[PDB]
Design a protein around this nucleic acid. Sequence first.
RNA 1: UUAAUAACUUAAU
Lengths: 370, 386
Amino acid sequence: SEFELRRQACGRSQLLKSRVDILEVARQFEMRINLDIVDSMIASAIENNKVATEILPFEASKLREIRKNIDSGFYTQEEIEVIARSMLDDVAELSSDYLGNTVVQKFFEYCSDPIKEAMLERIAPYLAAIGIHKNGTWAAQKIIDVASTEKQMDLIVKHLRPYTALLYFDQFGNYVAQCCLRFKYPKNTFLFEVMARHCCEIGQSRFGARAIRACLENENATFEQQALVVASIIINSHLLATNSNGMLLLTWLLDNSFFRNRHRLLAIHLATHLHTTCTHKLASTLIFKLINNKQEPESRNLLLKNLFFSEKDNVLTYILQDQAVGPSFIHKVITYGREFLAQFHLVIKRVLINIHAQPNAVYCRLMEEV
Amino acid sequence: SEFELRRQACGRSQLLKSRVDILEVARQFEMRINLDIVDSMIASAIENNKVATEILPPVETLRSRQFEASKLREIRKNIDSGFYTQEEIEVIARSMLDDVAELSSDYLGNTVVQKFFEYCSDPIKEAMLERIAPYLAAIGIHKNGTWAAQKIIDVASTEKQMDLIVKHLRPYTALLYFDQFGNYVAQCCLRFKYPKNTFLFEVMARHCCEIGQSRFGARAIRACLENENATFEQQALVVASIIINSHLLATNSNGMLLLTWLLDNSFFRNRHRLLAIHLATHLHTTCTHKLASTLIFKLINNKQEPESRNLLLKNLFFSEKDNVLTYILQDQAVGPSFIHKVITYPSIGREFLAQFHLVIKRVLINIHAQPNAVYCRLMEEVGMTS
RNA sequence: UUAAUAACUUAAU
Ligand SMILES: [Mg+2]
């Protein structure tokens, strides 16, 4: 699957490793986030290990008349329910039918809850498969959108949870996932558990990253749910910054977010990954945004210490030994003080000597600046 | 509105005042013109006074736009695939009569409404048109809807359809000519032929000033006059209206395009003579305007039209108490430069040249014009200084 | 000789 490929390129979940670091970041937001709620979600995130590999899956005239008579008000609610109960053996197959999907929709709009629960009991094991179907997705979102009882939501949550990651990857399934935000806490929690645990894999997909943004901006996400996923975004920022989709989440985090200390906490974490981020074409752009920001001095200060005044200049050496990104980054960073500027000038000159750096197109500007 | 500004810079219509002068210009056009038809057009032009100030779109309702988009995509997809009967199309169209007016301006709906008029039979077209006609003008000036409005007009096959279009477009006709898209919507009605397309020429004659001064209306007038469905009476009505508005058209490049078209047309006889006769009574504004004076200068320099340059020069220099020349030489940026250019042109003579020199000398003295950069060159030409 | 198809910025029958 696409999940298998990104799971291989992400390693073990940062939520598994840094359960205590995530709890601290959520605490260190200074937003009064209840840690017991956050930890229990990390608990249920680790508890629920069922993760799916793939998603596994009455002629035209007769269906049209059913839909025609329902739209015409020609039916009683009890008359619709007799029809529905007589099609339970087929209602799952119909949910993906180009005509059946419109009928199953009408069935859920008008039947009473016990019949909706009877239909859903036959559909639930296929809801994720219907959810990614071009036709079926209209029925699956309608089913979730009209889920009114507790028995209905639990059935949807139970049979969607193993496929929640795979849904975020899908052009239609990620909207099906978002439909579950209606359930509110605690039923919609499974969405944020999956987003936090697989923030690396989901964040690197074209749809999942955009669906994460949507979930975090949703009015039914509690602060704790937001804090859990955002903290996961932060401790994965060194991985998300390496591709455009992950960068979208980080861009969203810096700009369109109300989280206090997000800039500082993001910089603090990225300071231990300066060699890889500042040598990557896209990640270096973010590292510069964190330093160039004048209103975040603690970030720029900690980022500059780890950048130039390192254990043995190994951080600065790695960056300047890179060809396509490294030296351009360091030259920029400095060319935007005067006493402080010469102090950085001193450290750059030492590394370029030990690099044996030639003054070709890579080192023209930087060698002149120091 | 933007219409209010064009009429304020035009004044009241020259068609109302000079109803008999237009009839005069129509005669001296030669041609096979039935003169009585022209006057009855000026009559219908003045009777029909219901003119709209603005163009209002159909009120927008609330739609689940993505369920609506999928529906329209499939309708267009199945029509293009021939999977639909003409009856199946008409069933769908009849179910959307409450919606065709608002859909006509939609990015997708406009393509579907087009197909509906291409494929439905005439009763269903008339049924759709009865819902769309009061907004056709609005649809007509929409960047999307104009494709649907022009289609509806181009496929108007019955008399009931043309009359509906003419009925519900006439109040907005002037507004359509002003619009970058609506002016093509108005031209689509030229297909209707005489006498149904006459409303286009009535509006062009009454509002010749406002329309002829606009980038799109002036070019639309030129297109209508060159259209194969414009009778000689319709051409003469509008061209004569252009002549009696020449002093206003000559003040911008769009109206000047109409006058340059008329002169280079060579189909209307006595165009140069009739144009100069009218422009001789408006020498104050033309000879002081940057662009209009260019035309007046061309009308005199033309040696092959001697009668025109004689009437122009008599009214230029020999006016009551010198008020025409006074106004021109009182102007700074255009006036004096024009008179000097008229003098220093070897086509006047010498008996008349001294007569012109006398009056200009008298005006500049009675103006108390100083010999600065404006009047230095001209003052030496008549005496004054050296 | 003035022409011209919307927005969205992850949607879709
Ligand atoms: Mg798009």
